[PDB]
Design a protein around this ligand. Structure first.
Ligand SMILES: [Mg+2]
Ligand SMILES: [Mg+2]
Ligand SMILES: [Mg+2]
Ligand SMILES: [Mg+2]
Ligand SMILES: [Mg+2]
Ligand SMILES: [Mg+2]
Ligand SMILES: [Mg+2]
Ligand SMILES: [Mg+2]
Ligand SMILES: [Mg+2]
Ligand SMILES: [Mg+2]
Ligand SMILES: [Mg+2]
Ligand SMILES: [Mg+2]
Ligand SMILES: [Mg+2]
Ligand SMILES: [Mg+2]
Ligand SMILES: [Mg+2]
Ligand SMILES: [Mg+2]
Ligand SMILES: [Mg+2]
Ligand SMILES: [Mg+2]
Ligand SMILES: [Mg+2]
Ligand SMILES: [Mg+2]
Ligand SMILES: [Mg+2]
Ligand SMILES: [Mg+2]
Ligand SMILES: [Mg+2]
Ligand SMILES: [Mg+2]
Ligand SMILES: [Mg+2]
Ligand SMILES: [Mg+2]
Ligand SMILES: [Mg+2]
Ligand SMILES: [Mg+2]
Ligand SMILES: [Mg+2]
Ligand SMILES: [Mg+2]
Ligand SMILES: [Mg+2]
Ligand SMILES: [Mg+2]
Ligand SMILES: [Mg+2]
Ligand SMILES: [Mg+2]
Ligand SMILES: [Mg+2]
Ligand SMILES: [Mg+2]
Ligand SMILES: [Mg+2]
Ligand SMILES: [Mg+2]
Ligand SMILES: [Mg+2]
Lengths: 136, 58, 94, 84
RNA sequence: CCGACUUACCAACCCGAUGCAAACUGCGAAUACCGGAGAAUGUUAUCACGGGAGACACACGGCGGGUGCUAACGUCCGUCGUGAAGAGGGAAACAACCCAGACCGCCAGCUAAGGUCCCAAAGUCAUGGUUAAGUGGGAAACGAUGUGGGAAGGCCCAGACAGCCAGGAUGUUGGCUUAGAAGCAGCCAUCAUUUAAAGAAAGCGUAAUAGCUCACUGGUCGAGUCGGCCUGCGCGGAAGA
RNA sequence: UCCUCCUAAAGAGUAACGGAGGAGCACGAAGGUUGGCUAAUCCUGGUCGGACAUCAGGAGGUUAGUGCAAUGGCAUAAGCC
RNA sequence: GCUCAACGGAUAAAAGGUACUCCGGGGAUAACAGGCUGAUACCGCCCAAGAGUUCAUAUCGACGGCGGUGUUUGGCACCUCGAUGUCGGCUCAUCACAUCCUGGGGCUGAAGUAGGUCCCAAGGGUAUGGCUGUUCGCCAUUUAAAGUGGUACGCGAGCUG
RNA sequence: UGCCUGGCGGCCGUAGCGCGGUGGUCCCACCUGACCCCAUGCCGAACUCAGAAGUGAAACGCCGUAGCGCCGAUGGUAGUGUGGGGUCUCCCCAUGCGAGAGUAGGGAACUGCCAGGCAU
């Protein structure tokens, strides 16, 4: 369960998920999972994908999480009316723009890394793709 | 003094207040109305602002 | 060793560059030395297959513009955020 | 119950807007005593023919034309007046 | 009496590479606003004073947001438009959407949005292409030798992809483990040999064997074939009184 | 009721039972003026003394300080004597 | 000289009950139903760690993801306060299919009997009582079966109360 | 007129750091002494006074050098005003404006008045 250890404030505005991404390159490993669509990744979603992806490669190589849930999401309880202040923080999410690399992988063959990212992307709401490192 | 002809081709019902004032400063009152205006950069700026709804012949 | 047939850009800007990429060419620049920088456009797909090699980004490339030779180096590349496309390429002479 | 009673917020407070900012900009012709900028602290410093009040209000000490400029080693923003 | 080392532990500060922020800023627009000058246009459209008001329940739509579930024909602000207080044409019907502001008359013409097979006014118009789903004329993740287009790649008259015939063999039942692990529960290795070829085996099978295919190879046939990438339009996913 | 920040869309202003915090004082010096002075933190060495007291040097440069919240400001200090 | 702090300060000086109630109003504003929405709920599907002696997908299915319906608990306050009678029962129904039985079929960890799970199918059929106002629920005994939901949680100018 | 130095500015990092070298005629700085003028929460450290033996060490000035700081295009991208579109949580098209970061590069300041010393 990825989550900031402490925060300056406990609630944040809804905001908008606009623009393209920063960090669209495979900077740490050799292979990567790149987000094609935009949306929200919950810490549970990110962690479930990480379990499948690290277990797929039989605990070999190295696994990098490139995204962090830093945006808290509040939800009003069931059967409460509108107003009476903002809701309580239920979970955390990261905002995802098209092109952002979500996971990186190294130390394993490309055919195995491709299969591992397939299982991992089965857990994510956003469309993904397989990318490799390139020399700029 | 290219003294160009300005015609209004579209209506000014739900236009911005700035666009309505630009038509009034150009001297256009209705669709199809044609006016005589001297060719100055000040006038060309007016035409550019409301170019979507006026046409120029010269 | 790679020969790149490129034609100098007639018009530049955001609208022109987006029109160019829709027509399957993409802009690039050649700067360096003392001559003024030259803005060229060139075919996306030919260079896309060419740059799949790792030696493209190190060895000396050839660019042909108006039948005249310019010796350049692939200084930088801007890629599309998710599609396998090249936004722009920075070339340095010699 | 049929409805669930809510809580209460604790953030309802705010203070009145103080109408700070620049009153006369560059090129304004001002009389003596005219307030140029109302400030918290000295974001703009007093230049020639410009005085600074107790709350750091910059005001004209002469009739003339307002001019903003950047001077000094610290690149601070000074307001002066060309007497006209 | 002050010492000098050491190891696979923890390791702050610092360095390099990465992201995030309404209550972060060493940067920073477009617009908006204020002021000065100039022309043109505008029935003074501007300000001041005075007589009379009404109104202070707003609504939807666009754009920028808070709240809510980026739920609501929800709620709360900014700004613009419309309705209110606005007819006419279009969106089947449909205050708020699109076009457009009705002084009156005409059995006159041109156009806007939107349209032109019939209802129902006007193209059964012209040229090129795509779809076979009545898609068009509701809906996603995901799935699939649907189909069109593009760039490249592997192999091929030294015989290529099917298919058919024949082989697919000796260390060897590799070792470890295990009640058994005999190519094929699981671990490490994955090497040698005769070869035209053959894997310490891709899969089926056995309690373990056995057995059956595949990879690969020789012949037979005698001309193209295989797999990804990008992309257009389709297909399934798709159940309500 | 009042103050500070955000919402607040780079002039002003701008709502919600929106997000966060404070005030109902204090000081005859903590005011005026003149003169003078410049921190936090860390390293090294040093009696009790150690992570951390006073001292010397160095680094560093406001990362401190402001009678009390927050923002803006402050070295010519608005900070200290 | 005013916590006149309800801080532009009604008076120097003031709390409650009303189902015994009453008047003027409002769908400007709640309870029933309709409407919008679909967080929740229900149904379906996607990926498969694992359970299943061995074997992911006979049967299930963790961590997660995407939809459908309008169907529960909700959210809103658009309609009705110059009245839309509100639960259950009785009588009479009618539709949808996400099928309870009967009919047809695929797979099975389907020997047969008997099942399990999907696909097709709405022609017909689809309990009686005990206890509680109950709908439900538990229980007794049947049945081939005792379906799920919509119809103002169908039906009071048809009855009950 | 050339160089060196001091003071007061312009300017506000292309100008500031670091590293290396270089200067004592004059100047500058260190420096000598201090009942004294004056001063230290003590202290002639600083401030002050009386002086010029020594020295350019530090500092300060100057010269050189990119390990930094800093400045920095062209092109592209983000955004965005106006108008129009879509598959409308977000985009796209026409047109106008057009960053930030980064890159190639630049870069060891330039300059004004006066006063002094050396040289002509
Ligand atoms: Mg554009
Ligand atoms: Mg608070
Ligand atoms: Mg009122
Ligand atoms: Mg009101
Ligand atoms: Mg309003
Ligand atoms: Mg509303
Ligand atoms: Mg109007
Ligand atoms: Mg009215
Ligand atoms: Mg109308
Ligand atoms: Mg009509
Ligand atoms: Mg006509
Ligand atoms: Mg006709
Ligand atoms: Mg035709
Ligand atoms: Mg259809
Ligand atoms: Mg076996
Ligand atoms: Mg489909
Ligand atoms: Mg403002
Ligand atoms: Mg603004
Ligand atoms: Mg009051
Ligand atoms: Mg009041
Ligand atoms: Mg009454
Ligand atoms: Mg009434
Ligand atoms: Mg109402
Ligand atoms: Mg209701
Ligand atoms: Mg309302
Ligand atoms: Mg109704
Ligand atoms: Mg009523
Ligand atoms: Mg009535
Ligand atoms: Mg069925
Ligand atoms: Mg029949
Ligand atoms: Mg009975
Ligand atoms: Mg029913
Ligand atoms: Mg009923
Ligand atoms: Mg009835
Ligand atoms: Mg009756
Ligand atoms: Mg009756
Ligand atoms: Mg540029
Ligand atoms: Mg720049
Ligand atoms: Mg730059």
């Amino acid at each position: 369960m990825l989550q900031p250890k402490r925060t300056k404030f406990r609630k944040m505005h809804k905001g908008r998920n606009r623009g393209l991404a920063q960090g669209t390159d495979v900077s740490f490993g050799s292979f990567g999972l790149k987000a094609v669509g935009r949306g929200r990744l919950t810490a549970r979603q990110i962690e479930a994908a990480r379990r499948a992806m690290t277990r797929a490669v039989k605990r070999q190589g190295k696994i990098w999480i490139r995204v962090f849930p830093d945006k808290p999401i509040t939800e009003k309880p069931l059967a409460v009316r509108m107003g009476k202040g903002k809701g309580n923080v239920e979970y955390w999410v990261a905002l995802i723009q098209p092109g952002k690399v979500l996971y990186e992988m190294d130390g394993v063959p490309e055919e195995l890394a491709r299969e591992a990212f397939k299982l991992a992307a089965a857990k994510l709401p956003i469309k993904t793709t397989f990318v490799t490192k390139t020399v700029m | 003094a290219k003294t160009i002809k300005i015609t209004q081709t579209r209506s000014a019902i739900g236009r911005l207040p700035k666009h309505k004032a630009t038509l009034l400063g150009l001297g256009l009152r209705r669709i199809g109305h044609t006016v005589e205006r001297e060719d100055t950069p000040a006038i060309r700026g007016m035409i550019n602002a409301v170019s979507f709804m006026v046409k120029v012949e010269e | 060793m790679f020969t790149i047939n490129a034609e100098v850009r007639k018009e530049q800007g955001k609208g022109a560059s987006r029109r160019l990429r829709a027509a399957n060419k993409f802009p690039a620049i050649i700067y360096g030395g003392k001559e003024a920088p030259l803005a060229i456009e060139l075919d996306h797909d030919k260079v896309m297959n060419m740059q799949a090699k790792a030696e493209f980004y190190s060895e000396v490339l050839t660019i042909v513009v108006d039948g005249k030779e310019i010796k350049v180096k692939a200084q930088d590349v801007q890629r599309h955020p998710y599609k396998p496309k090249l936004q722009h390429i920075d070339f340095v002479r010699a | 119950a049929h409805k669930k009673a809510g809580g209460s917020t604790r953030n309802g407070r705010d203070s009145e807007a103080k109408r700070l900012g620049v009153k006369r900009f560059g090129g304004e012709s001002v009389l003596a005593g005219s307030i140029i900028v109302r400030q918290r602290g000295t974001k703009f410093h007093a230049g020639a023919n410009v005085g600074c009040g107790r709350d750091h209000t910059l005001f004209a000490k002469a009739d003339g034309k307002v001019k903003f400029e950047v001077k000094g080693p610290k690149n601070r923003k000074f307001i002066s007046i060309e007497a006209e």
